[PDB]
Amino acid sequence: GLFGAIAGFIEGGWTGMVDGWYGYHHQNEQGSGYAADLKSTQNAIDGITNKVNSVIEKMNTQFTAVGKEFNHLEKRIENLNKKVDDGFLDIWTYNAELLVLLENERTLDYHDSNVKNLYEKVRSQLKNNAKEIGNGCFEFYHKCDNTCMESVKNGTYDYPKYSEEAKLNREEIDS
């Protein structure tokens, strides 16, 4: 992947998470489960929807009858007509094929970028209060209940609130 998250340091996808494209798995004393980050998912769904509509709706054609009829003494203009139909066929086929090829690659990179930014948003929030244990997972140095978990997902994690407890537990763990 272009950004390294999908099929990268996050190795696989979650069939268990069904309500969103990008989300979270959590586990605390209150239990575990999957949840989807609604903001990032809806932003990506809006973006891709706009992309598909842009590809479709920018093609606005008028009423037209492609066919033409020529008699046996009009072979040259008949071939001229064929060249026009063929040239348009070649232009549209090649352009359509490459547009799908190139934009499909951009779409997968887009998802890869969205995952990386989501991981980095959390990592920049938790800082040293949690450990980066790989596969997109953070292991906390302080207890993080459901309310604390939602604050991380909401982008409102209070680092100073838990920094002292995490610091003491981190030093004890490392010692």
d(C-alpha 165, C-alpha 163), whole Å: 6
Please, what is the minimum distance in Å from the beta carbon of residue 90 to another protein?
15
d(C-alpha 128, C-alpha 123), whole Å: 9
Please, what is the minimum distance in Å from the beta carbon of residue 95 to another protein?
24
d(C-alpha 16, C-alpha 157), whole Å: 25
Please, what is the minimum distance in Å from the beta carbon of residue 84 to another protein?
12
d(C-alpha 146, C-alpha 162), whole Å: 15
Residue 19 or 74: which CB sits closer to another protein?
A: 74
Please, what is the minimum distance in Å from the beta carbon of residue 91 to another protein?
18
Residues 49-88: x/- map of binding to another protein (CB under 8 A)?
-----------------------xx-xx--xx--x-----
Size of the site for another protein (CB under 8 A): 7
Q: What is the CA radius of gyration of the chain?
A: 27
Residue 52 or 84: which CB sits closer to another protein?
A: 84
Report helix, strand or coil for 74. Answer: coil
Residue 75 or 106: which CB sits closer to another protein?
A: 75
Do residues 44 and 20 make contact, with C-beta atoms less than 8 angstroms apart?
no
Residue 58 or 72: which CB sits closer to another protein?
A: 72
d(C-alpha 84, C-alpha 74), whole Å: 16
Please, what is the minimum distance in Å from the beta carbon of residue 76 to another protein?
6
Amino acid at 71: N
Residues engaged in binding another protein (CB under 8 A): 72-73, 75-76, 79-80, 83
